[PDB]
# Entry
Amino acid sequence: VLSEGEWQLVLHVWAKVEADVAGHGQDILIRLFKSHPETLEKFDRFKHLKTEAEMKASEDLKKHGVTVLTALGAILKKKGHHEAELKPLAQSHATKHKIPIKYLEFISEAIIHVLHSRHPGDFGADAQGAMNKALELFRKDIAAKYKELGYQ
Ligand code: HEM
# Structure
């Protein structure tokens, strides 16, 4: 469980993200796809993209980045009391999109990397550890729902 101090660090950097939701979503998805190409293959929408330049030029990709970060932001602002927000996410990602928990670990890594690149003054070690804990909590709670549903 995160402390109030930890949540403050998480939400302080997150408020910086929300000044450019779409730029962050691009950077995060591109990092994910480049670092872990098996993730790209889960997106029928995006698997035609073969280069970073093509990814950066895709408005559809940029749109989806906003969808992802918007959902994450709503979860983080619940500070742990996010069960209603995760239910539908866990359900779609387990049963429709077929996304393993490991891939949620991968996108967590991408998020943390992009936050450090874009917001280093608000993303020192204390904030990095707090964000790690927040995204761990996210994964933990999704993983429990996957397990309920027979997906992990
Ligand atoms: C921070 C983690 C993530 C969040 C907050 C998130 C959020 C969302 C949201 C809000 C949607 C649309 C509503 C829905 O279908 O549930 C969606 C769709 C989808 N997500 Fe995620 N997602 C996350 C991670 C991933 C990862 C790691 C993958 C793949 C490796 C993934 C694959 C998909 C796919 C395939 C769709 C459908 C895209 C489409 O329209 O064709 N998601 N996600």
About this structure: Residues 39, 42-43, 45, 67-68, 71-72, 89, 92-93, 97, 99, 103-104, 107 surround protoporphyrin IX containing FE (CB under 6 Å). Helices lie at 4-17, 21-35, 37-40, 52-57, 59-77, 83-95, 101-118, 125-149.
